[PDB]
Structures are given as C-alpha cells and as structure tokens.
Amino acid sequence: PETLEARINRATNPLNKELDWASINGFCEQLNEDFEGPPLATRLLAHKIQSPQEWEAIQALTVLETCMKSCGKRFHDEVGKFRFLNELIKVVSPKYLGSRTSEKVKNKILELLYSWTVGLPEEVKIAEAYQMLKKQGIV
C-alpha cells in the first residue's frame, strides 16, 4: 500500500503530461486511512506547493483542492491550522516567495482560500488568513 510520499510523488511528478487521478485520489484515500495521515499529508503538500518548478506546484494544489472536497473533518482541521496556512502565505507574499512565484500559482492559492471560507465556515483560521491577505492588498 503506497506511502503518502510515494503517492504525492506520482501525483505531482513534473514529468506528467496530464493530471493523474489514480494518484491524486489514492492520496486522499490513504491520508484518511491512518490517524496520522492528515498531519503528514499536510506537511508533504506544503513542500510541493513551494516548488520553484511550476507544474509540481500546480499539481500539488490540485491535490490539496481535491482532498478538501472529499475528505472530512480531520483533514479540513489540519489544513485550517496556521502551521499549514502560513506556508500558503509565504508563497503569495512578495516578502517571502511571492516575487518569483508565477501568478498562476498565487492566484490558485487565493482562489482556494476564498472558496474554503465559503465552503468551510467553521475553519475560522482560514477566514483569518484570508482577511489578513485581503486587508494587506494581496487579495
């Protein structure tokens, strides 16, 4: 049974000609298997999303997007920690990675932030992250 690592590496592989649903979805499934999947999965995604290689970053955010839709409380709750959200902020701030990150990637992140503030009202740290970007001019 594929480790989360193996899985994420197939789903975000910069060699990929198209999106790989077998592995995007096997990743969401597997993270949901163990108590500790959600923290690990969230750690692995943050690294990939900060990749300087764009298709890596882009496929990573797809996986993020997918698992937020289909997974439950436990996932949503690891994502809506500042431990994870702060990593998404580093990518969109010019202060941090913002300046040599494509608009593609930064616009993807912001769009996801927004939809989860509407989709997931209870993840209140997500609201706060987004209001912070909004109030700073990034949004």
Binding site: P39, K81, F82, R83, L85, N86, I89, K90, S93, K95, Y96, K125, E128, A129, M132, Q136
Partner: peptide, 9 residues
C-alpha cells in the same frame, strides 16, 4: 500539535 501563530505579512 499546537498550533502556530498567524504571520503578519
């Protein structure tokens, strides 16, 4: 586990 505090910026 904790968790962190929000960034400013």
């Amino acid at each position: 586990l904790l968790d962190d505090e929000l960034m400013s910026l």
